[PDB]
Each structure stands twice: as C-alpha cells, then as structure tokens.
Amino acid sequence: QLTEEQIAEFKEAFSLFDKDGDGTITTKELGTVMRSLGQNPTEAELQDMINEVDADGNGTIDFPEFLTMMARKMKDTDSEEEIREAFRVFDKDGNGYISAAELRHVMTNLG
Amino acid sequence: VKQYYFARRGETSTHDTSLPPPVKVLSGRSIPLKEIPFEATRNELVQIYLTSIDKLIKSNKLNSIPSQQIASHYLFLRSLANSETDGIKKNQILSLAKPLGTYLASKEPHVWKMINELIEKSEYPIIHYLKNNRAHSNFMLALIHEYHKEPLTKNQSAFVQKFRDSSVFLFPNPIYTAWLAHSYDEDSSFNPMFRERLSTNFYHSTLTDNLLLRTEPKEVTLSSEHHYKKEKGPIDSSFRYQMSSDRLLRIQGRTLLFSTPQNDVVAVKVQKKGEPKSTLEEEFEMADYLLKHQRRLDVHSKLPQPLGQYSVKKSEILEISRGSLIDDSKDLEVYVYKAPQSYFTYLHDKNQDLEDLTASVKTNVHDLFVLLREGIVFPQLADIFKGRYQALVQLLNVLQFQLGRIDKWQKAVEYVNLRSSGLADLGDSLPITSLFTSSDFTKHYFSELLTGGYHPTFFDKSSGTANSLFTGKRRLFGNYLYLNTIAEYLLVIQLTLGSYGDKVTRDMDKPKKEAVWRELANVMFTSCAEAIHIMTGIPQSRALTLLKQRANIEKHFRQTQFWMTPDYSKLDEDTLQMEQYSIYSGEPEYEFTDKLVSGVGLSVDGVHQDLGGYNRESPLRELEKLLYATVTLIEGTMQLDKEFFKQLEQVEKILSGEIKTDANSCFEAVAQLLDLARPGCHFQKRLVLSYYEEAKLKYPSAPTDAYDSRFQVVARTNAAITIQRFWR
Ligand SMILES: [Ca+2]
Ligand SMILES: [Cl-]
Ligand SMILES: [Cl-]
C-alpha cells in the first residue's frame, strides 16, 4: 500500500500526461511521467498492457513495484546532502526552516 | 479490473458547421453578422502599444508617469520579449524596454531592485507583478490613449470596449493563460472586481470569455462500444411483475412504488402523455450500460436493476392505484425496475443528518462528472426553466451582464434526479457530442450563441453589417456549452442544498440554524472542488484553496442563508438595507423594487419565493463567482496544460539536437516551461528541473547565473519533500 500523499501525486501526473482523456496513456508517454516523479529506468514493458496501454489501476500498481525496490538509504540521504551547501557539514536551525515550507509542518522532532 | 472512459477528447477545425446563417433580420432588413477576430485585433493593439512605448521614449517624459506604471510597462515588455520566438523581434522589444530600465535604475533605485527580484523568479514577471489590484489599472490602454494620438479602428474600439477592465486581456496566449492560472495561487490577492467612482465592477465572466476565445474548438469522439454508438439488441423482458395493490408503498409521480420481503422497492414507471416507447427503452438500456460498466467507471450511485419494459392495459394501472392519483392511452408501455428506498428520497429531504447529506451529495457530484468524462450529459437534472436558465449566461448572449432571476427556485429541484442513493432516473440522457454540434437541443436553447451578435452598437451603417467579437463564438460554441453544463450541474446542487437548508432551519435556535448554513456552504465549495479534481486531476484539497482564493466561503454562507429562507420578508423595507451590508461586506447592496410577500419574500406568483427581483440579477452573487471560479479553473488549467506541453516539445527538440540554438536560449526555453507548470503542482517542476540539469550537461560551457536561483528553489523544495516523505 502507498501513502495518500503520493497516490495524489501519481493521480495528477497520470491525469496530466493522459493528453486525450480516458486512461489512454501510451508507453511512449510513461517515460516522461516517471521522470516527473523521480524515476529513470531502461526497460519497462509489462504489468497490465490492458490493450497495449494501461489504466490508472495499473499505474498505481506499476509504481509500488518500482517503489518497493528503492533502497532509500541513498534517497533520503542525497536529500539531506542538498542543503549541506559547504560539504558534509550537516544543517542547523535551517534544517527546520526548509521542512517548514515545502510540503509539511506540525512539530518536527529536531534531533 | 480495467477502469477507463469510453470517450477520447480532441480538437477540430470549426464548430460552426451546419449552423443557422449569421444574419439578424429586424424591421424587414436582414443584416449579416460578422466576426471580429480576437487574436488579430489583440495583436494590432499590442503593436499600437509598442509604437506608443516608442513615442513615450521620444517624449523624454518618463518622470511624468508614476514609477509603478513604468514598472508595469517594463515588466510587460520583458515578459513579451521572452514569449517571442524569433530573436530579431524580441530584440526590437528589448530595444524598447532598455530606456525604461535605464530610467528606473537611475531615478527609481528601489523599484528597480524589486523588479529584478521578479525577473529572476520568472520568465513572465508581469504575471506575478499583477497578482493583485495592480491588474485593475490598465497600463497598456492608458499608454495607448495618451500617446497613440489617432483614432482606433472600429474593431480595436470593439476589443477595447469588451476587455477594458485589465491589460491582461491583451496579453498573448501563453502570458494570459499563465497569469490566469496563477491568479488563484496563495500569494495572489487578485479578485476580478474593482471599485470605480463609487461604482463596483465585476468581470469574472470576462476572464472566462477572454480565455475561451483563445481556445481551439473541442470535440469528443465516442468509442465504438459507447452507449450511443454500440448496436444494442432487443430488450428481453421475459418476466412480468405481478402488480398487487397492497404491496404498493407510495406513488411518486407516474411511478408506482411496490414493497418486497427484501426491504427494497420494485418501481413501475408509466408512459407519460406524450412519450414514445423508445424513451423507456433508452432508460432501460442506460441502466444496463451503467450496471455493466459500474466498476469500469467507478460509479458510486446505487444503480437500479432494470427488470422489464413492456405494455400494460390502462385499466389494470388505474385499478391498482388509490390514495394520491399523466398517463394517456388504454395501452401504456411500462419500465419496471428494482432500487433501494434511498433511490426515492430526494437529496433535499429534511430527514437526513448532514453526515448523510454530505456523503450523498459527494456521491452525486462524483457520478455527474465521471459520467461527463464518459461522455453522457443529463440536461434535465432539475426543472430550472425557451426560458431555460443559463448558468454561464453572460458568455452565451450579448445583452446580459449577470445571472437571471431563478423563478420558484425550490420547485425547480423539487423532483430533482439527485437522491440519497446517488444519481437517479437517468433516462433523459444526452451525448456530450450534442453540445459541440448543431443539435436540436442547441439551436433551441442557444440560438443566439449559434447565430451570433446583433446589437445597435454593433451595427455599421457604412458596412451594412453588424460586427462583434461575439460572432467569433460560432466556431467555438461547443466549448462554451461544455463549461455551461459544468456550472449547470453545480447550480442544481446548490438549489438542492439550499432547499434542504430552508426546510431544516424552518421551525428551529439561531446558532443551530446558522451553523447548518455554513456547513451547507462548505459542502457546496467541496462539491466544486470535487468537480475540478474529476475534470483536471488537481488534488481536491488544492482545488479547494485555489477556489477559496476567488470565492468567499463566508460571504456565500450568509447570502445563501439570507435569500433562500423567508425571514427577510418579515423585515420592513429599510431595516432590510441594514442587513444587506452584513452579507455584501464591500460590494453594493442588492437593489430591488418589488413588494415583498409576507412569509415568503420576493415572489412573482405570491406563493413561491424566487431568487431575485422581477427582472433583476439573482442575489446569490458569490455563488455566481463560485461557478465562474470553478469553470475558469477547469478551462484555465486545461489551456495551461496545453501551453505546457507545447513548450515541453521545444525544450525536447533543443535538448535532443533537433533544433540548434545557443546556450543562453536553451536555458530560457527550459525556464519558460517552468512558468507554464500548474500552480502548486510540484512534480511538473521536478520534470523541468530534470530538463535543466540535462541542459547543463549539454552546455557545461554555459554560464547559468540567470536560472541557478529559480531552479535551486525547485531542487531544495524537492529535497525537503522527500525528507518529509520519510515519516516512518
Ligand atoms: Ca490517453
Ligand atoms: Cl501612460
Ligand atoms: Cl463578445
């Protein structure tokens, strides 16, 4: 199961790149949608095909497969390494500032 | 299982085919109706604005003009130059912009500092500079009148008189769409209403009109297995329901409701006075098409099981009926079906807690717009009536300036097709394609929109023709009727909700009543937010905030509760204009002449309360803004999407090598794509950040001082998002 925050993100991305309406999203387009979601694979040619294209039910199942294989130790890191502007110098009171305007708020436990 | 719609949306050359002839006959003389082209006239006024900028530079009178109308001019000029494709012409705009910058940097150092903080934030700094009351000052038209000292053509005059309210209406297509989309964002305090010399102007409808005239004629193609296209076999009503006369609960209007040991209802619907069998067969097959594709469409209503369609002698019908007794003949075709009792409780019924009301309303608006994407329109959900009410009426006629007086509003949603079960009684369907073609429905109710634009102002004695930008709507009238259907759906919701509210608050604790009406306000805004999400994919939470930027929830609560219950009638005429100020906080009070019927309010028939004076506006003003906010957010988001993808290819052709250009331009092609992302939509800027990094891979040569900062904030936002995503 995914989180409500990212199924919303996936639903809009799907709705945006479906250019003509009804779930008729063609394999040629799904490269860019996953690029917009933080993915860049080489070969993905399965998981419904539904005719040769797929619906949203197939999309939101296609994803956790690509998200239940993400060794996010390097994903959650890299993320901290951004604001580490100098190098390896971790953040400070600023690391509660950033988390107070991107997508969330409400009592970060600053350790 | 598979879940998708059976309709593909595309575009077509022209909706104006097989339309009535563009001719207004009056006093025996036939006057042809001619289009004033939007974009052609728009561009003439922008080049006139450009020449005027040049006559302002030569006048060496840049001090005579206030500092933040040279800010408007320069910011617009910089934005226009970026929007220009070829380098030769964008340099002739920067030619014009540089004296305005030289002066501002020298004689207005602070404003210069504020302007440059915007120019590195966006490629179209004018659209964020105008996210406030600054938009109401028409700097472009002001400069045109002052320095272009020569009379406008008859069409620049026409364009000016129609779009006088803001300079944004002259912006080229991408800049206007981007401005209109982002004018709903959280920094933006813009609302399309300014106060004139004691007078109040509203131009929410003009935003929609100026948007719609830049759009391409839509067209929907139905799958070959669609309900209206697939050849369906005969109905196999192999069984006949045996009508007892004590199993009948009730009789809700030419429909008899029968009980069952399973605590649901077998209903039998009888032929109307004028009604063919076809209609009852269509209702049968609709119920089956819904049933078959209910998972496919994720339809949420409780759907009736179509039992049989056959003929029954009128003697048996009249025999089994007694207690509340539109049938015509001695033989009556019948449609009998099974449905829960929720299917027969109208959604405006007093006997629902507002937990069940909200839940059931959510069901209805979901299936209304899911079935719209499916391509099916329900044009008679309620009898809001030729004289059939038009939700988006200023965009469909030349005369009207606001929405008309809803007559006997509570009786309109009386037998509304919205039930606790969900959508109901879905026989009187219409294909969405009927709105984009010259169907019988459209030339009857929308004949002006399809003929187009007569008014004495329009008439040119020289020409012999009536010229207006309205006649341009002939090639696009389907786009107008599409948006109007959306607003029409949500207005039937609103009357239904208000009906419930009136019948629950009557015979009631003043705080308990007021609290009910603001929950009714919230479910209405929530309904429109749901529509936007179903139509565009925008997260409904964000669709709600975008909406509440434009529509004042609390103003809507207090004009709904005041006008849809009769307490104001018990006021004398002039403590009433003491109460109106509380519901129109800045806006003018609702002026009206009519004599009030005691215990009712405004009532032409003296028995049923209406929404509005005899020949006035509907007084639900922020409802009107709500609908336009809803409909503009939909159509605006879709046009922004199109400009996004149109520019997306540009950066991809430059990136791949299919179009060779310099480094310093490839980056501003990418940065421009940043400006066409949806407001509050992050992944769209994650995607263009990916394009930015690839451009720096392609051009390590290049300096990136102009876009490092604007693309850092996307990078830092995406980093911050994923650390917040690690909530575990
Ligand atoms: Ca598609
Ligand atoms: Cl001026
Ligand atoms: Cl017009």
Convert B112-164 into a string of H (helix), E (strand) and C (coil). Answer: HHHHHHHHCCCCCHHHHHCCCHHHHCCHHHHHHHHHCCCCCCHHHHHHHHHCC
Kindly state the tokens that stand for B610.
């209406």
Each residue of B375-398: b (16+ CB within 10 Å) or e?
Answer: bbbbebbbebeeeebbbbbbbbeb
Say whether residue B324 is in contact with chain A using an 8 A CB cutoff.
no
Q: Which helix (H) or strand (E) holds B600?
A: none
How far is A22 from chain B, CA to nearest CA, in Å?
5
How far apart (Å, rounded) are the C-alpha atoms in residues B490 and B530? 11
Chain B residues near residue A5 by CB distance under 8 angstroms: 725
Say whether residue B433 is in contact with chain A using an 8 A CB cutoff.
no
How far apart (Å, rounded) are the C-alpha atoms in residues B430 and B441? 9
CB contact under 8 A, B722 and A104: no
Task: Report whether B600 contacts B570 (CB < 8 A).
Answer: no
Residue from B10, B65, B43, B21 nearest B153 by CA: B43
- Phi, psi angles (nearest 5°) of residue B131: -85, 50
- Breaks in chain A listed by the residue before each, with C–N > 2.5 Å: none
Q: Which amino acid is at B475?
A: R
Q: Are residues B498 and B619 in the same domain?
A: yes
How far apart (Å, rounded) are the C-alpha atoms in residues B162 and B152? 14
Last residue of a domain, one of B202, B234, B264: B202
How far is B310 from chain A, CA to nearest CA, in Å?
36
What chain B residue is nearest to A6 in terms of C-alpha separation?
B725
Nearest-CB residue to A22 (from B5, B537, B682): B5
Q: Are residues B301 and B399 in the same domain?
A: no
- Phi, psi angles (nearest 5°) of residue B313: -60, 140
Evaluated on CA atoms B534, B538, B544, B548, the torsion sign reads: negative
Which long-range contacts does B240-248 make (Cβ < 8 Å, 24+ apart)?
A: B240/B308, B240/B310, B241/B266, B241/B268, B241/B307, B241/B308, B241/B336, B243/B268, B243/B316, B243/B320, B244/B320, B245/B319, B245/B320, B245/B322, B248/B320, B248/B321
Q: Are residues B334 and B344 in the same domain?
A: no
B605 three-state secondary structure: coil
Q: Are residues B352 and B370 in the same domain?
A: yes
Beta bridge partners of B418: B423
Say whether residue B682 is in contact with chain A using an 8 A CB cutoff.
yes
Asked if residue B414 is part of any domain, the answer here is yes
Where on the phi/psi map is residue B539: left (φ > 0), alpha (ψ -120 to 50), or beta? beta
Task: Report whether B15 contacts B435 (CB < 8 A).
Answer: no
CB contact under 8 A, B720 and A23: no
Q: How far is the CA of B283 from the centre of ligand 1 (A)?
A: 30
Task: Report whether B411 contacts B607 (CB < 8 A).
Answer: no
Distances (CA, A) of B331 to B41, B284, B327, B441, B443: 62, 19, 10, 30, 34
Q: Which amino acid is at B353?
A: D
Q: Which helix (H) or strand (E) holds B466?
A: strand B465-468
Distances (CA, A) of B50 to B57, B90, B164: 11, 12, 18
How far apart (Å, rounded) are the C-alpha atoms in residues B101 and B97? 6
Kindly state the tokens that stand for B432.
């969405």
**Alpha helix locations (H) across B244-353?**
277-292, 294-297, 314-319
Q: Are residues B438 and B393 in the same domain?
A: yes
- Phi, psi angles (nearest 5°) of residue B666: -50, -40
Each residue of B160-191: b (16+ CB within 10 Å) or e?
Answer: bebbebbbbbbbbbbbbbbbbbbbbbeebebb
Q: Are residues B403 and B487 in the same domain?
A: yes
Residue from B153, B154, B81, B93 nearest B119 by CA: B81
Q: How far is the CA of B65 from the centre of ligand 2 (A)?
A: 6
Domain that holds residue A42: 4-68
Asked if residue B630 is part of any domain, the answer here is yes
Whose tokens are 């129609």? That residue is B162
Last residue of a domain, one of B309, B339, B369: B339
Q: How far is the CA of B56 from the centre of ligand 2 (A)?
A: 8
Split into its structural domains, chain B has a count of 3
Last residue of a domain, one of B308, B339, B370: B339
Task: Tell me which ligand sits closest to the C-alpha of residue B142.
Answer: 2
How far apart (Å, rounded) are the C-alpha atoms in residues B413 and B404? 17
Beta bridge partners of B404: B617
Chain B residues near residue A32 by CB distance under 8 angstroms: 687
Is residue B329 packed enough to be buried (19+ CB in 10 Å), middle (13-18) or exposed (0-12)?
Answer: exposed
The whole-angstrom distance between residue B202's C-alpha and the CA centroid of its chain comes to 16
- The crossing angle, in degrees rounded to 10, of helices B204-212 and B621-656 is 40
What chain A residue is nearest to B678 in terms of C-alpha separation?
A16
Say whether residue A96 is in contact with chain B using an 8 A CB cutoff.
no
Domain that holds residue B358: 1-32+207-226+340-728
Q: Are residues B83 and B23 in the same domain?
A: no
Selected residue of B645, B725, B726, B728 to mutate for chain A interface (largest A Cβ count, 10 A): B725
Task: Report whether B124 contacts B130 (CB < 8 A).
Answer: no
Each residue of B278-291: b (16+ CB within 10 Å) or e?
Answer: eebbbbbbbbbbbe
How many CA within 13 A on the CB side of residue B340? 12
CATH number for the domain spanning B276: value is: 3.30.200
Is residue B448 packed enough to be buried (19+ CB in 10 Å), middle (13-18) or exposed (0-12)?
Answer: middle
Residue from B357, B364, B628, B627 nearest B519 by CA: B357
CB contact under 8 A, B537 and A14: yes
Q: Are residues B537 and B466 in the same domain?
A: yes
Asked if residue B238 is part of any domain, the answer here is no
Q: Are residues B9 and B104 in the same domain?
A: no
How far apart (Å, rounded) are the C-alpha atoms in residues B251 and B507? 27
Q: How many CB pairs under 8 A join A and B?
A: 96
Quote the strand ranges of A1-111, DSSP E: none
Q: Which amino acid is at B387?
A: G
Pairing relationship of beta strands B29-35 and B465-468 according to DSSP bridges: parallel
- Breaks in chain B listed by the residue before each, with C–N > 2.5 Å: 325, 385, 508
Selected residue of B530, B535, B637, B683 to mutate for chain A interface (largest A Cβ count, 10 A): B683
Task: Report whether B111 contacts B67 (CB < 8 A).
Answer: yes
Query: Please, which residues have CB within 8 angstroms of residue A7's CB and are 6 or more apart in sequence?
Result: A60
Q: Are residues B683 and B580 in the same domain?
A: yes
Chain A residues near residue B723 by CB distance under 8 angstroms: 76, 79-80, 99
Task: Tell me which ligand sits closest to the C-alpha of residue B100.
Answer: 2
Which residues of B are annotated binding-site positions for Mg(2+)?
Answer: 425, 428
Beta bridge partners of B268: B256, B336
How far apart (Å, rounded) are the C-alpha atoms in residues B562 and B198? 25
How far apart (Å, rounded) are the C-alpha atoms in residues B267 and B304? 10
Task: Report whether B477 contacts B367 (CB < 8 A).
Answer: no
How far apart (Å, rounded) are the C-alpha atoms in residues B534 and B300? 13
Say whether residue A61 is in contact with chain B using an 8 A CB cutoff.
no
CB contact under 8 A, A57 and B3: yes
**Alpha helix locations (H) across B609-704?**
621-656, 663-675, 682-698
Method underlying the structure: X-ray
Chain B residues near residue A8 by CB distance under 8 angstroms: 539
- Phi, psi angles (nearest 5°) of residue B604: -70, -40
Nearest-CB residue to B721 (from A15, A80, A103): A103
Q: Are residues B604 and B706 in the same domain?
A: yes
How far apart (Å, rounded) are the C-alpha atoms in residues B351 and B349? 6
CATH number for the domain spanning A23: value is: 1.10.238.10
Q: How far is the CA of B162 from the centre of ligand 3 (A)?
A: 7
How far is A95 from chain B, CA to nearest CA, in Å?
9
Selected residue of B723, B726, B727 to mutate for chain A interface (largest A Cβ count, 10 A): B723
Which residues of A are annotated binding-site positions for Ca(2+)?
Answer: 18, 20, 22, 24, 29, 54, 56, 58, 60, 65, 91, 93, 95, 97, 102
Distances (CA, A) of A2 to A58, A63, A106, B38, B724: 14, 9, 22, 47, 15
CB contact under 8 A, B537 and A36: no
Q: Are residues B257 and B153 in the same domain?
A: no
Asked if residue B243 is part of any domain, the answer here is no
Q: Which helix (H) or strand (E) holds A16?
A: helix A4-17
